[PDB]
Amino acid sequence: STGSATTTPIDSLDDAYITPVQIGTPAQTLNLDFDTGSSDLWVFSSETTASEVDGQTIYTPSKSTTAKLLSGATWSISYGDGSSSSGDVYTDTVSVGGLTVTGQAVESAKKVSSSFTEDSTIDGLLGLAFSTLNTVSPTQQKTFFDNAKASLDSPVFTADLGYHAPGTYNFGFIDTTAYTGSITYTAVSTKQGFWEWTSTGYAVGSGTFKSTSIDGIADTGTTLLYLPATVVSAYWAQVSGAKSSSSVGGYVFPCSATLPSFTFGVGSARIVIPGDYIDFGPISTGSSSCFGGIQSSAGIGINIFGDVALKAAFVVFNGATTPTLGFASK
């Protein structure tokens, strides 16, 4: 049992990636934002407040013959976004790329934040962190990957995000076709329930590599690269005009400037993010200030390797008891 589904950016900035998943019987196709930094499968639904759904496709549990109320079961999630979602919960058959899982917990939103309502391309989330994080009460649920694991050929999914382009999520196998050279695997701490790992240093452009341990999370659900104040300061110091703004709330640079690449260390390996991935374009329409894709971790308390870093690598989340994280060049 394997599964491969195409993931597609929702905008030309690649703010997020959406993958079609099939829920219910017969199937309802929803486009979900695969989030390795949460643990809840949540969807817009027939129960979602009608003043909170704006062109999103809803899951109607009443048309699924596989769908069943988990009586008493309840969810509430809160992101670092400040994003919120909550409601009640169903079990149902869920298929990703032809990999089918029955009795998946499908948490139906009665309530959703502004941030989600505004985002017409996202029909909900598929959380791919560790199940410890999952929110449902009073009985806590498992994640789709955890539900599939035993069925899979290998208990593993890979992430292959595209820059301005589709890519792929594969389940159950490693497409040796899709990367260059060798995969470097590195230790994962599950202790906070994140794909949490420790990077071995960094280089800015064609500079010297600094060996320094940077602890943070692989998160396909976060757009930007979030690194300590020290490292982020070194990066922008290399771009004439870049400064941290109070107003806009992070580093900006003159759109006419030239972003140096950013190198991160995975073991004795190195992954270069091209300076082009670091461009998030004009902070406002018309503006000649442009938003940087590397920002300070100082106010989140965790360093996040978000889509800007992951899109530059072929990433394996080995979910094997001793979980590991692999990086390859692509």
Binding site: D15, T220, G221, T222
Partner: peptide, 6 residues
């Protein structure tokens, strides 16, 4: 229009 998912 960035996203930061916990």
């Amino acid at each position: 229009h960035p996203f930061h998912x916990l």
